[PDB]
Design an enzyme around this catalytic site. Sequence first.
Site, PDB file in Angstrom:
ATOM      1  N   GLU A   2       1.548 -27.429   5.905  1.00  0.00           N
ATOM      2  CA  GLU A   2       2.459 -26.694   5.037  1.00  0.00           C
ATOM      3  C   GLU A   2       3.787 -27.432   4.944  1.00  0.00           C
ATOM      4  OE1 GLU A   2       2.231 -24.655   2.731  1.00  0.00           O
ATOM      5  OE2 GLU A   2       4.401 -24.770   2.463  1.00  0.00           O
ATOM      6  N   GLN A   3       4.280 -27.593   3.715  1.00  0.00           N
ATOM      7  CA  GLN A   3       5.477 -28.393   3.478  1.00  0.00           C
ATOM      8  C   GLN A   3       6.721 -27.725   4.053  1.00  0.00           C
ATOM      9  OE1 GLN A   3       6.424 -31.177  -0.423  1.00  0.00           O
ATOM     10  NE2 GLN A   3       6.809 -28.968  -0.569  1.00  0.00           N
TER      11      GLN A   3
ATOM     12  N   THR B 153       2.846 -19.578  -2.505  1.00  0.00           N
ATOM     13  CA  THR B 153       3.756 -19.276  -3.605  1.00  0.00           C
ATOM     14  C   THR B 153       3.819 -17.775  -3.887  1.00  0.00           C
ATOM     15  OG1 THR B 153       2.766 -21.294  -4.500  1.00  0.00           O
ATOM     16  CG2 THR B 153       4.474 -20.245  -5.844  1.00  0.00           C
TER      17      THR B 153
ATOM     18  N   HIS C  41      -8.635  13.017 -13.672  1.00  0.00           N
ATOM     19  CA  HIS C  41      -7.624  13.631 -14.519  1.00  0.00           C
ATOM     20  C   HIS C  41      -6.568  14.317 -13.662  1.00  0.00           C
ATOM     21  CE1 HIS C  41      -6.016  15.526 -18.197  1.00  0.00           C
ATOM     22  NE2 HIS C  41      -5.840  16.595 -17.442  1.00  0.00           N
TER      23      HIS C  41
HETATM   24  C1  LIG Z   1       7.682 -16.421 -10.788  1.00  0.00           C
HETATM   25  C2  LIG Z   1       6.180 -16.420 -10.679  1.00  0.00           C
HETATM   26  C3  LIG Z   1       5.471 -15.253 -10.950  1.00  0.00           C
HETATM   27  C4  LIG Z   1       4.079 -15.219 -10.858  1.00  0.00           C
HETATM   28  N1  LIG Z   1       3.410 -14.032 -11.137  1.00  0.00           N
HETATM   29  C5  LIG Z   1       2.102 -14.028 -11.045  1.00  0.00           C
HETATM   30  C6  LIG Z   1       1.395 -12.792 -11.332  1.00  0.00           C
HETATM   31  O1  LIG Z   1       1.897 -11.725 -11.668  1.00  0.00           O
HETATM   32  N2  LIG Z   1       0.031 -12.889 -11.204  1.00  0.00           N
HETATM   33  C7  LIG Z   1      -0.676 -14.016 -10.839  1.00  0.00           C
HETATM   34  O2  LIG Z   1      -1.906 -13.939 -10.769  1.00  0.00           O
HETATM   35  N3  LIG Z   1      -0.008 -15.175 -10.568  1.00  0.00           N
HETATM   36  C8  LIG Z   1       1.311 -15.169 -10.671  1.00  0.00           C
HETATM   37  N4  LIG Z   1       1.989 -16.328 -10.393  1.00  0.00           N
HETATM   38  C9  LIG Z   1       1.217 -17.514 -10.018  1.00  0.00           C
HETATM   39  C10 LIG Z   1       0.915 -17.587  -8.528  1.00  0.00           C
HETATM   40  O3  LIG Z   1       2.102 -17.356  -7.769  1.00  0.00           O
HETATM   41  C11 LIG Z   1       0.362 -18.974  -8.203  1.00  0.00           C
HETATM   42  O4  LIG Z   1      -0.160 -19.545  -9.398  1.00  0.00           O
HETATM   43  C12 LIG Z   1      -0.732 -18.977  -7.137  1.00  0.00           C
HETATM   44  O5  LIG Z   1      -0.195 -18.490  -5.906  1.00  0.00           O
HETATM   45  C13 LIG Z   1      -1.339 -20.350  -6.948  1.00  0.00           C
HETATM   46  O6  LIG Z   1      -1.762 -20.494  -5.577  1.00  0.00           O
HETATM   47  P1  LIG Z   1      -2.391 -21.839  -5.055  1.00  0.00           P
HETATM   48  O7  LIG Z   1      -3.805 -21.553  -4.538  1.00  0.00           O
HETATM   49  O8  LIG Z   1      -2.281 -22.900  -6.086  1.00  0.00           O
HETATM   50  O9  LIG Z   1      -1.494 -22.206  -3.803  1.00  0.00           O
HETATM   51  P2  LIG Z   1       0.088 -22.305  -3.792  1.00  0.00           P
HETATM   52  O10 LIG Z   1       0.633 -20.977  -3.253  1.00  0.00           O
HETATM   53  O11 LIG Z   1       0.587 -22.654  -5.145  1.00  0.00           O
HETATM   54  O12 LIG Z   1       0.367 -23.465  -2.762  1.00  0.00           O
HETATM   55  C14 LIG Z   1       1.636 -24.150  -2.728  1.00  0.00           C
HETATM   56  C15 LIG Z   1       1.977 -24.464  -1.294  1.00  0.00           C
HETATM   57  O13 LIG Z   1       1.696 -25.857  -1.014  1.00  0.00           O
HETATM   58  C16 LIG Z   1       2.788 -26.406  -0.312  1.00  0.00           C
HETATM   59  N5  LIG Z   1       2.827 -27.847  -0.543  1.00  0.00           N
HETATM   60  C17 LIG Z   1       3.070 -28.496  -1.725  1.00  0.00           C
HETATM   61  N6  LIG Z   1       3.053 -29.805  -1.630  1.00  0.00           N
HETATM   62  C18 LIG Z   1       2.783 -30.033  -0.289  1.00  0.00           C
HETATM   63  C19 LIG Z   1       2.632 -31.214   0.462  1.00  0.00           C
HETATM   64  N7  LIG Z   1       2.736 -32.442  -0.054  1.00  0.00           N
HETATM   65  N8  LIG Z   1       2.367 -31.089   1.782  1.00  0.00           N
HETATM   66  C20 LIG Z   1       2.261 -29.865   2.304  1.00  0.00           C
HETATM   67  N9  LIG Z   1       2.381 -28.682   1.696  1.00  0.00           N
HETATM   68  C21 LIG Z   1       2.643 -28.835   0.393  1.00  0.00           C
HETATM   69  C22 LIG Z   1       4.008 -25.648  -0.820  1.00  0.00           C
HETATM   70  O14 LIG Z   1       5.089 -25.743   0.101  1.00  0.00           O
HETATM   71  C23 LIG Z   1       3.438 -24.229  -0.907  1.00  0.00           C
HETATM   72  O15 LIG Z   1       3.530 -23.545   0.337  1.00  0.00           O
HETATM   73  C24 LIG Z   1       3.394 -16.385 -10.485  1.00  0.00           C
HETATM   74  C25 LIG Z   1       4.097 -17.552 -10.212  1.00  0.00           C
HETATM   75  C26 LIG Z   1       5.485 -17.582 -10.305  1.00  0.00           C
HETATM   76  C27 LIG Z   1       6.219 -18.863 -10.004  1.00  0.00           C
HETATM   77  C1  LIG Z   2      -2.693  24.544 -10.127  1.00  0.00           C
HETATM   78  C2  LIG Z   2      -3.869  23.809 -10.714  1.00  0.00           C
HETATM   79  C3  LIG Z   2      -3.923  22.421 -10.624  1.00  0.00           C
HETATM   80  C4  LIG Z   2      -4.996  21.708 -11.158  1.00  0.00           C
HETATM   81  N1  LIG Z   2      -5.005  20.326 -11.044  1.00  0.00           N
HETATM   82  C5  LIG Z   2      -6.018  19.675 -11.551  1.00  0.00           C
HETATM   83  C6  LIG Z   2      -6.030  18.229 -11.433  1.00  0.00           C
HETATM   84  O1  LIG Z   2      -5.166  17.540 -10.894  1.00  0.00           O
HETATM   85  N2  LIG Z   2      -7.141  17.633 -11.999  1.00  0.00           N
HETATM   86  C7  LIG Z   2      -8.185  18.287 -12.633  1.00  0.00           C
HETATM   87  O2  LIG Z   2      -9.116  17.615 -13.092  1.00  0.00           O
HETATM   88  N3  LIG Z   2      -8.164  19.648 -12.737  1.00  0.00           N
HETATM   89  C8  LIG Z   2      -7.132  20.296 -12.219  1.00  0.00           C
HETATM   90  N4  LIG Z   2      -7.104  21.665 -12.327  1.00  0.00           N
HETATM   91  C9  LIG Z   2      -8.222  22.338 -12.999  1.00  0.00           C
HETATM   92  C10 LIG Z   2      -8.071  22.381 -14.515  1.00  0.00           C
HETATM   93  O3  LIG Z   2      -6.781  22.884 -14.867  1.00  0.00           O
HETATM   94  C11 LIG Z   2      -9.152  23.290 -15.101  1.00  0.00           C
HETATM   95  O4  LIG Z   2     -10.259  23.323 -14.207  1.00  0.00           O
HETATM   96  C12 LIG Z   2      -9.651  22.864 -16.482  1.00  0.00           C
HETATM   97  O5  LIG Z   2      -8.588  22.969 -17.429  1.00  0.00           O
HETATM   98  C13 LIG Z   2     -10.848  23.670 -16.938  1.00  0.00           C
HETATM   99  O6  LIG Z   2     -10.425  24.620 -17.938  1.00  0.00           O
HETATM  100  P1  LIG Z   2     -11.472  25.369 -18.844  1.00  0.00           P
HETATM  101  O7  LIG Z   2     -12.075  24.377 -19.844  1.00  0.00           O
HETATM  102  O8  LIG Z   2     -12.462  26.075 -17.998  1.00  0.00           O
HETATM  103  O9  LIG Z   2     -10.600  26.427 -19.664  1.00  0.00           O
HETATM  104  P2  LIG Z   2      -9.171  26.956 -19.223  1.00  0.00           P
HETATM  105  O10 LIG Z   2      -8.116  26.043 -19.855  1.00  0.00           O
HETATM  106  O11 LIG Z   2      -9.094  27.029 -17.743  1.00  0.00           O
HETATM  107  O12 LIG Z   2      -9.078  28.423 -19.843  1.00  0.00           O
HETATM  108  C14 LIG Z   2      -9.696  28.745 -21.107  1.00  0.00           C
HETATM  109  C15 LIG Z   2      -8.811  29.655 -21.928  1.00  0.00           C
HETATM  110  O13 LIG Z   2      -9.438  30.947 -22.097  1.00  0.00           O
HETATM  111  C16 LIG Z   2      -8.426  31.923 -22.111  1.00  0.00           C
HETATM  112  N5  LIG Z   2      -9.015  33.218 -21.783  1.00  0.00           N
HETATM  113  C17 LIG Z   2      -9.313  33.704 -20.538  1.00  0.00           C
HETATM  114  N6  LIG Z   2      -9.836  34.907 -20.544  1.00  0.00           N
HETATM  115  C18 LIG Z   2      -9.878  35.239 -21.890  1.00  0.00           C
HETATM  116  C19 LIG Z   2     -10.327  36.386 -22.572  1.00  0.00           C
HETATM  117  N7  LIG Z   2     -10.839  37.461 -21.964  1.00  0.00           N
HETATM  118  N8  LIG Z   2     -10.228  36.394 -23.921  1.00  0.00           N
HETATM  119  C20 LIG Z   2      -9.716  35.324 -24.534  1.00  0.00           C
HETATM  120  N9  LIG Z   2      -9.263  34.189 -23.999  1.00  0.00           N
HETATM  121  C21 LIG Z   2      -9.373  34.209 -22.665  1.00  0.00           C
HETATM  122  C22 LIG Z   2      -7.391  31.430 -21.109  1.00  0.00           C
HETATM  123  O14 LIG Z   2      -6.137  32.034 -21.401  1.00  0.00           O
HETATM  124  C23 LIG Z   2      -7.406  29.917 -21.376  1.00  0.00           C
HETATM  125  O15 LIG Z   2      -6.419  29.541 -22.330  1.00  0.00           O
HETATM  126  C24 LIG Z   2      -6.032  22.409 -11.793  1.00  0.00           C
HETATM  127  C25 LIG Z   2      -5.982  23.795 -11.887  1.00  0.00           C
HETATM  128  C26 LIG Z   2      -4.910  24.503 -11.353  1.00  0.00           C
HETATM  129  C27 LIG Z   2      -4.884  26.006 -11.469  1.00  0.00           C
HETATM  130 CU   LIG Z   3      -6.091  17.461 -21.825  1.00  0.00          CU
END
Ligand SMILES: Cc1cc2nc3c(=O)[nH]c(=O)nc-3n(C[C@H](O)[C@H](O)[C@H](O)COP(=O)(O)OP(=O)(O)OC[C@H]3O[C@@H](n4cnc5c(N)ncnc54)[C@H](O)[C@@H]3O)c2cc1C
Ligand SMILES: Cc1cc2nc3c(=O)[nH]c(=O)nc-3n(C[C@H](O)[C@H](O)[C@H](O)COP(=O)(O)OP(=O)(O)OC[C@H]3O[C@@H](n4cnc5c(N)ncnc54)[C@H](O)[C@@H]3O)c2cc1C
Ligand SMILES: [Cu+2]
Lengths: 441, 440
Positions: free
Chosen positions: B32-33, B41, B425
């Site tokens: 490593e350099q 990197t 959801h």
């Molecule tokens: C700003 C920035 C953002 C990036 N964002 C992303 C991203 O979101 N997603 C993504 O997939 N990639 C991203 N990249 C790219 C990613 O960081 C690199 O392309 C990736 O890590 C390449 O790895 P590598 O296997 O080539 O090894 P590297 O990590 O590139 O190896 C370089 C190493 O070799 C050493 N070295 C060099 N010459 C010598 C030598 N002569 N002797 C000994 N050691 C030496 C260096 O000191 C260093 O430690 C980004 C790069 C930059 C610069």
């Molecule tokens: C606090 C809470 C958190 C939840 N979080 C999640 C979550 O993170 N992810 C997830 O996937 N699910 C979640 N659920 C479940 C989700 O909200 C329901 O299971 C889903 O909307 C199913 O609804 P449904 O299609 O059965 O009809 P619903 O939307 O449940 O109700 C059908 C409609 O019929 C109406 N109705 C009822 N009785 C009568 C009647 N006698 N006459 C006429 N209309 C009537 C009601 O007013 C309502 O508008 C959560 C539920 C609760 C209570």
């Molecule tokens: Cu919805």
Amino acid sequence: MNKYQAVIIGFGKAGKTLAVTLAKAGWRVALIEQSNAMYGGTSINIGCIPTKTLVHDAQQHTDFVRAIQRKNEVVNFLRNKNFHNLADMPNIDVIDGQAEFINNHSLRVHRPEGNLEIHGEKIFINTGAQTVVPPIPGITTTPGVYDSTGLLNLKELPGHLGILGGGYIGVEFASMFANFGSKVTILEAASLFLPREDRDIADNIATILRDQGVDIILNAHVERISHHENQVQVHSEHAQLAVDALLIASGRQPATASLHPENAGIAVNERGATVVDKRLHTTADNIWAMGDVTGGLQFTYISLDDYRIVRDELLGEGKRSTDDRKNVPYSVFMTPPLSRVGMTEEQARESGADIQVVTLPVAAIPRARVMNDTRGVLKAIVDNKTQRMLGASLLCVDSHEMINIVKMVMDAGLPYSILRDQIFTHPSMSESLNDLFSLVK
Amino acid sequence: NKYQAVIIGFGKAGKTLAVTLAKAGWRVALIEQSNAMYGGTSINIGCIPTKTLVHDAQQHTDFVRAIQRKNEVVNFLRNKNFHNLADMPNIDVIDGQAEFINNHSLRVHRPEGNLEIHGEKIFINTGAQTVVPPIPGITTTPGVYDSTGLLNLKELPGHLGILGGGYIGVEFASMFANFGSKVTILEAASLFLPREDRDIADNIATILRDQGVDIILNAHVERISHHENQVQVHSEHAQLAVDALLIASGRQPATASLHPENAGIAVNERGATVVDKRLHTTADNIWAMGDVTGGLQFTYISLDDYRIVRDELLGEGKRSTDDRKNVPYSVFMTPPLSRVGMTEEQARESGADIQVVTLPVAAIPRARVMNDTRGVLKAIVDNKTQRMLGASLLCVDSHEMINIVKMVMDAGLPYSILRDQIFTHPSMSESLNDLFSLVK
Ligand SMILES: Cc1cc2nc3c(=O)[nH]c(=O)nc-3n(C[C@H](O)[C@H](O)[C@H](O)COP(=O)(O)OP(=O)(O)OC[C@H]3O[C@@H](n4cnc5c(N)ncnc54)[C@H](O)[C@@H]3O)c2cc1C
Ligand SMILES: Cc1cc2nc3c(=O)[nH]c(=O)nc-3n(C[C@H](O)[C@H](O)[C@H](O)COP(=O)(O)OP(=O)(O)OC[C@H]3O[C@@H](n4cnc5c(N)ncnc54)[C@H](O)[C@@H]3O)c2cc1C
Ligand SMILES: [Cu+2]
Ligand SMILES: [Cl-]
Ligand SMILES: [Cu+2]
Ligand SMILES: [Cu+2]
Ligand SMILES: [Cu+2]
Ligand SMILES: [Cu+2]
Ligand SMILES: [Cu+2]
Ligand SMILES: [Cu+2]
Ligand SMILES: [Cu+2]
Ligand SMILES: [Cu+2]
Ligand SMILES: [Cu+2]
Ligand SMILES: [Cu+2]
Ligand SMILES: [Cu+2]
Ligand SMILES: [Cu+2]
Ligand SMILES: [Cu+2]
Ligand SMILES: [Cu+2]
Ligand SMILES: [Cu+2]
Ligand SMILES: [Cu+2]
Ligand SMILES: [Cu+2]
Ligand SMILES: [Cu+2]
Ligand SMILES: [Cu+2]
Ligand SMILES: [Cu+2]
Ligand SMILES: [Cu+2]
Ligand SMILES: [Cu+2]
Ligand SMILES: [Cu+2]
Ligand SMILES: [Cu+2]
Ligand SMILES: [Cu+2]
Ligand SMILES: [Cu+2]
């Protein structure tokens, strides 16, 4: 007005999607909604969209009341857009009011001025779920307790928050309000914390919440709730705790009581779910049921998949069913969020199959350090004979997007090597799967 | 000593090859350099320090605090990368600038002692280097830095000047604009992002111009000087003054100090080592992974270069660079633009029956949850094949959705799989349900 070809009861995810799909196809669709403040469904106004918006603001430690109104800005915007995406179609009649069955063809829509009677050749139940109120004396009377919806309308941040239930949604509020700077007390009536998850995960999740000021009380049976000094007093035997607010997170049951489905021959179970086969059919002819009234997994994507099966029956292209569902993914939105697919370590070790459990700490993910949150763990189970992955538990930031990558490979039957030898983006957390399946030996 | 494997440079491929050959029982020696270059990197200058700053910019955090948090994460990962290499007793990470004297031996010019190392197999991994255009005054002008120097600035500049509209210049333009610093991009081309779609580049431009970034095309940068507290970039009949100047002119492979002719590797033009599909060198037992190949300058490509060499030394059969299909890339502006496959012009030029679908980000509810409805979604489907030929994802968390897109094209599945897939959801990946629903 007249008879409709398609009548859908409820503005849920499956209902609003089927509405335009049939309206675009030329059907005379009528959607009935019981509240003008829930256009778009539970996901937009109550569940997914509002809570996740508050969590993200809580991640940055944003002022609470400033973030609550930002939730109102998004929800009030998306509620009107979802209403107008139906009402602006001439084939759609967005009727306001509460629907109730009379026939398998006729319904009664309750409105304060006067009722209406709607007919339909094919009716589609989609009424979602409703909050489960536990049989604890004092909840309906004490003014400081809240539902999930009632909590999302607080005027300012409460100092002490009591949560009734250790469910997934309860933990979301436990992490959201703790990040808002508030002592959260969770109360679950179970011996273990999150009994449906690996204890490796359950422990790690509990240490994250403990350090942010959330204490977890397990196997607690509260007996009565009251307000004794401007604070919600929850009273267990030989244990009493006062909170400035109490949230009920004891689950959500199918909302079918006010619908009276027995009149149309629609049968229900003990919880209230409409009985449904694999094609979203009920006991009544030409009447479907989609969403949380199925009694199944209450996810927004699970409801939209129900629309897929219903749409593939009325508009052709053969027929699909619920039997097409495998490796269903889910995620609980704390910080860092826990996303899960497949089986748990306890399920894999019990099956008896030759497995190999690999674990990678999140601190070993450079992108997790780029985002200033190295908390969490990454665990996956690999079948040693078939080389496939049976499950995973990704506890890290942005796990809700990585989960869909591992879920795709598991449904494709491809081995774990696919995710190990895969060119991902950099810096990212999808590439975290490159290092996780390198631990396999 | 007598090493069975020698790797020049701490880059991503050589860092992983040295620890892989160690677990196999090889006597590995990584040279490593620099002392401040452990992990390569990426850890010290590349992706990690830059996008650490980008995360802090979207929060509009104070600039000098973001540099400190960078200076502490680059310090942690640097220490680790030395630990994983020194924890293996088979590896001897030698410090010094390595130089080729013959095929089978190397001399490192190091202050402690000039010293000659012989290896059985040598793996070149020296990476790349930023070269600068020969503009008069760029030699000795205060306030002119490249990507490395700009990362260690004391306080935020009032007006930042960027020479180059390249991808690395747009990352710094978006990052410094989010810190409250006016950015000025000086592009010598008539195009903004010429390798991009006409659709995509205009959105990126509007997003940048909305944050006070002036994309100046056809810029005639003749000389650079320093006068009155500021850097003055001499122009056509005028000159513009900025407080700091960043050079974004692309990086050339670092094959010069090696004096690599002594080993007998044919160096191409631009200095890159000529390399075949299995990364073989014209010398029989030398290899070159990373940016010295002359290929795409990505950290995830160097890791794949590693896998190719690992499949050759210890792997069954041989695996080549011809397997690399649909290589994705992400520019980490805000919001990030991630892209895979072809664009609309590449698809239209190929002569295929294509359809273009576009979903604005404002229709993604998750974008409102994250408070960034900016950007656009775009993908192209081939009607003959029902497959996806390319996608442009300009949105938040796009660097995570594009991996789902690439794997479908990698396994080569129809677009209907992402359209009907059950996604979580609420999330960003689930917009692919809505994006591919627009295909008729
Ligand atoms: C700003 C920035 C953002 C990036 N964002 C992303 C991203 O979101 N997603 C993504 O997939 N990639 C991203 N990249 C790219 C990613 O960081 C690199 O392309 C990736 O890590 C390449 O790895 P590598 O296997 O080539 O090894 P590297 O990590 O590139 O190896 C370089 C190493 O070799 C050493 N070295 C060099 N010459 C010598 C030598 N002569 N002797 C000994 N050691 C030496 C260096 O000191 C260093 O430690 C980004 C790069 C930059 C610069
Ligand atoms: C606090 C809470 C958190 C939840 N979080 C999640 C979550 O993170 N992810 C997830 O996937 N699910 C979640 N659920 C479940 C989700 O909200 C329901 O299971 C889903 O909307 C199913 O609804 P449904 O299609 O059965 O009809 P619903 O939307 O449940 O109700 C059908 C409609 O019929 C109406 N109705 C009822 N009785 C009568 C009647 N006698 N006459 C006429 N209309 C009537 C009601 O007013 C309502 O508008 C959560 C539920 C609760 C209570
Ligand atoms: Cu919805
Ligand atoms: Cl629950
Ligand atoms: Cu914090
Ligand atoms: Cu309106
Ligand atoms: Cu009939
Ligand atoms: Cu009561
Ligand atoms: Cu208290
Ligand atoms: Cu009791
Ligand atoms: Cu009172
Ligand atoms: Cu007693
Ligand atoms: Cu009733
Ligand atoms: Cu039937
Ligand atoms: Cu399953
Ligand atoms: Cu963050
Ligand atoms: Cu790394
Ligand atoms: Cu902003
Ligand atoms: Cu150690
Ligand atoms: Cu020889
Ligand atoms: Cu010397
Ligand atoms: Cu010798
Ligand atoms: Cu200026
Ligand atoms: Cu000119
Ligand atoms: Cu002067
Ligand atoms: Cu002139
Ligand atoms: Cu002049
Ligand atoms: Cu020299
Ligand atoms: Cu060869
Ligand atoms: Cu954010």
